């Protein structure tokens, strides 16, 4: 990890990350066969098996009764794309002919690759443990109609077997037929491994996904098709990580304020967040819910990314004298804050705030000065800005400094309007 403290804009760019981008959705279809459970009844008062039967039947029936701020823009588009794709494939599957074809394909095996009439190819899995149990053990155990059988083993086995079905029903009913994430009941680890190995991508991506399958699970989700006969049919929309090991970097900033004649003039870069490179294409991922780091690799979603121009990387070098319209917020009220960076921390504190750095060994090391200041992690462990203790990160990497008169201090700000929320740096300074 290489971090460069760009003192021109009180910002730090931390490069050395290896991209993991999701390029497509892989659809997996499940038929959680429940069995002929609605035809069975209990007629000897309360029992463990009666309670489990009532729970299952209620679950089934209630299941039948169901179904430019770039960050905002990007996350909205991402959620829209995900829901639209899931709903479209669910619509293609909801046809009776399509469901019958899927069942026929899965009739003699537990996994088959069916080409849907809509032209898309989707994997299919059959979760038949619950149906096999309900048909071979439960049905012949509760004969006549007596659920108060002496065998407690049967009741406990029923509870274990229907755990998955009841959990799936809970998730779908609570979320109204669309879960936000893949529980371990929607798709187990082995099933996720099989779906990863069946993905239409290359060996490197497949191996990386085999290693980060729980990240895959975090980024996936599920959807309920419907209840057909006595079988719950749902699908899982898994993410395809078709790109791996590509350059990426993150930008952080803090208010670069400068006092003169008792008044201040602050600025804050609004183009913060993650970036990545893809075969001559730089992609901005500005919304804060889709880009997660894990060590050196950064996982992001390409549907939530904006295709920014290449040139945009010049704001990290000569933001002041670059022809790209770099984005910055502006104002005249100082804000004192600590903007923690991956390897260091930017400390801003001005009139009326006291700063100081330290460590667990000695409370106080020194009293920081006024203005923006880069505190290296190797230098200290914690920093204070007024009874507020921030603990620095302990990641290892070389920290750099890029000397240069800060823009806030070197230019005369625009008199009116000064407070601009998100504008080109031209409008604010040196207008």
């Amino acid at each position: 990890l290489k971090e460069s403290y760009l003192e021109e804009s009180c910002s730090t760019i931390t490069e050395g990350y290896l991209s993991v981008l999701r390029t497509g959705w892989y659809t997996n279809v499940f038929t959680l066969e429940v069995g002929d459970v609605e035809n069975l009844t209990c007629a000897d008062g309360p029992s463990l098996i009666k309670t489990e039967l009532d729970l299952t039947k209620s679950a089934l029936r209630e299941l039948r009764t169901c179904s430019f701020v770039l960050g905002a823009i990007a996350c909205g588009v991402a959620t829209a794309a995900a829901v639209t794709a899931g709903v479209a494939i669910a619509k293609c599957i909801r046809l009776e002919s399509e469901v019958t074809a899927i069942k026929n394909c899965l009739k003699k095996t537990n996994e088959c690759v069916s080409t849907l009439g809509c032209g898309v190819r989707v994997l299919a899995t059959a979760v038949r443990e619950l149906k096999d149990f309900v048909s071979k053990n439960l049905t012949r155990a509760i004969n006549k109609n007596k659920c108060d059988i002496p065998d407690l083993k049967m009741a406990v086995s029923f509870s274990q077997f229907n755990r998955r079905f009841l959990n799936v029903v809970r998730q779908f009913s609570d979320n109204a037929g669309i879960t936000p994430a893949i529980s371990k009941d929607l798709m187990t680890d082995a099933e996720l491994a099989r779906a990863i190995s069946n993905m239409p991508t290359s060996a490197g991506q497949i191996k990386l996904m085999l290693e980060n399958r729980c990240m895959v699970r975090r980024k996936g989700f599920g959807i309920l098709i419907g209840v057909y006969g006595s079988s719950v049919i749902y699908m899982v929309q898994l993410p395809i990580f078709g790109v791996i090991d590509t350059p990426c970097w993150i930008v952080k900033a803090a208010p670069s304020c400068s006092e003169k004649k008792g008044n201040y003039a602050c600025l804050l870069r609004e183009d913060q967040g993650w970036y990545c490179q893809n075969a001559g294409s730089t992609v901005y991922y500005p919304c804060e819910k889709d880009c997660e780091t894990r060590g050196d690799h950064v996982f992001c979603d390409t549907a939530a990314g904006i295709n920014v121009a290449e040139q945009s990387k010049e704001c990290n070098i000569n933001i002041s004298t670059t022809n790209y319209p770099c984005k910055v917020s502006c104002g005249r009220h100082p804000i004192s804050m600590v903007a923690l960076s991956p390897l260091g921390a930017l400390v801003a504190c001005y009139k009326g705030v006291s700063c100081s750095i330290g460590s667990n060994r000695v409370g106080i090391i020194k009293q920081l000065n006024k203005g923006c200041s880069y505190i290296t992690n190797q230098d200290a462990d914690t920093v204070t800005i007024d009874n507020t203790v921030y603990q620095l990160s302990k990641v290892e990497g070389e920290q750099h400094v890029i000397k240069g008169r800060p823009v806030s201090s070197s230019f005369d700000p625009v008199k009116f309007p000064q407070d601009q929320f998100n504008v080109a740096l031209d409008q604010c300074f040196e207008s």
Epitope: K2, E15, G16, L18, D245, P247, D296, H400, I402
Partner: antibody
């Protein structure tokens, strides 16, 4: 902390292919600085840059030497190597591996000792 | 590939004003670098951007100038400041050519 140490064959027969390698101790290639670059210094003239590679795999090469150079990097072993073909008499010099000073986009901050191949007869 | 004209060598005494000049054919803007190499040793990065001073370098090495004039100056020469000083261009890779080299020796 960081020490680039050239390695290879000290005896290279004439008309063969030019092979070179570099290493980094006390640091990593995969996320080092980047731009693991290469250099040669022919007797008579000065220093000349051949090409470099990045921690991911981007590989820039000299316009008037890129037809023969294939500079590769290996993030696992932490070594970026060199491969120069069509060696001539003018290609007898001191070759250096180095690390780049990502100020604007590239500058040199670290150099190796220098691997020299001597021809005696 | 590109040839630049500069003095072959220069001599002076300790504490003299040492000035160097590195010419370019195309354009450099601010992507110019300075290296010092002793005999039998690798070059040393002293200035990056032609105006930024690398950490841990004596203040004597400095570079100023605006417009069309640029040059490296050494005000307080030191006994360990006798060596060949190249220059490098990082404008438009992969065209990165060092200078022929300038050597400073005592008189």
């Amino acid at each position: 902390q960081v020490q680039l140490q050239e390695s290879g064959s000290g005896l290279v027969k004439p008309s063969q292919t030019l092979s070179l390698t570099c290493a980094v101790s006390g640091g990593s290639i995969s996320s080092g600085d980047s731009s693991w670059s290469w250099i040669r210094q022919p007797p008579g003239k000065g220093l000349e840059w051949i090409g470099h590679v990045y921690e991911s795999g981007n590989t820039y090469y000299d316009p008037s030497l890129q037809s023969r150079v294939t500079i590769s990097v290996d993030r696992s072993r932490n070594q970026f190597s060199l491969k120069l073909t069509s060696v001539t008499v003018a290609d007898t010099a001191v070759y250096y591996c180095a690390r780049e000073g990502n100020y604007g986009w590239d500058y040199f901050d670290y150099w190796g000792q220098g691997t020299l191949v001597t021809v005696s007869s | 590939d590109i040839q630049m004209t500069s003095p072959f060598s220069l001599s002076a005494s300790v504490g003299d004003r040492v000035t160097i000049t590195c010419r370019a054919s195309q354009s450099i803007n601010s992507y110019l670098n300075w290296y010092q190499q002793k005999p039998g040793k690798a070059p040393r990065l002293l200035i990056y951007a032609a105006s930024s001073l690398q950490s841990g370098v004596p203040s004597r090495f400095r570079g100023s100038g605006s417009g069309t004039d640029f040059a490296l100056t050494i005000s307080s020469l030191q006994p360990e400041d006798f060596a060949t000083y190249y220059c490098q261009q990082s404008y438009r890779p992969p065209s990165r050519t060092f200078g022929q080299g300038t050597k400073v020796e005592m008189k």
